[PDB]
Design a protein around this ligand. Structure first.
Ligand SMILES: [Ca+2]
Ligand code: NA
Ligand SMILES: [Zn+2]
Length: 164
């Protein structure tokens, strides 16, 4: 398991394009004519579809679990599987406010078909929070980027284990 300080450092490194990941693009990379060229810093964990939202999560969960747990499926399928001990799935209730490093999962409305997914960067309040995500633009080309979200479509949070 990882400490909060280790988690926090890794989130900043995602956003800066310096994360210690073998799935981080070093030089602008392209293979799928439907998507934009992946900039340095993008995370592509599967070698399909350039840098999608779930690619970030695949990398993060591999790091959290010392490469023991590889996610399968699309963003929306993450709430149908378990990442193991100390990972907990929470329904997003109007009461619910997440914690830095938790995983935010969008499965309703405009996100229903594939889901969307990202990492909680700032837990915020009941109105907004800051997410760190890939592919909110649909072009699958940018590195992980921060965005303010209003909980629209957001159905679940995945709590991750934190080492004291
Ligand atoms: Ca990919
Ligand atoms: Na909420
Ligand atoms: Zn997606």
């Amino acid at each position: 398991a990882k400490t909060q300080a280790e988690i926090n450092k890794r989130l900043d490194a995602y956003a800066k394009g310096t994360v210690d990941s073998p799935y981080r693009v070093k030089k602008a990379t392209s293979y799928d004519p439907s998507f934009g060229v992946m900039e340095a810093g993008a995370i592509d964990a599967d070698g399909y579809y350039h840098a999608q939202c779930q690619d970030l999560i695949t990398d993060y969960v591999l790091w959290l679990t010392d490469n023991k747990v590889r996610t399968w499926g699309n963003a929306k399928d993450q709430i149908k599987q378990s990442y193991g001990t100390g990972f907990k799935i929470h329904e997003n209730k109007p009461s619910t406010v997440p914690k830095k490093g938790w995983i935010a999962v969008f499965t309703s409305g405009s996100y229903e078909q594939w889901g969307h997914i990202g990492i909680v960067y700032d837990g915020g309040n009941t109105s907004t929070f800051t997410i760190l995500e890939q592919n909110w633009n649909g072009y699958a080309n940018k590195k992980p980027t921060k965005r303010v979200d209003n909980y629209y479509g957001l159905t679940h949070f995945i709590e991750i284990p934190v080492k004291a």
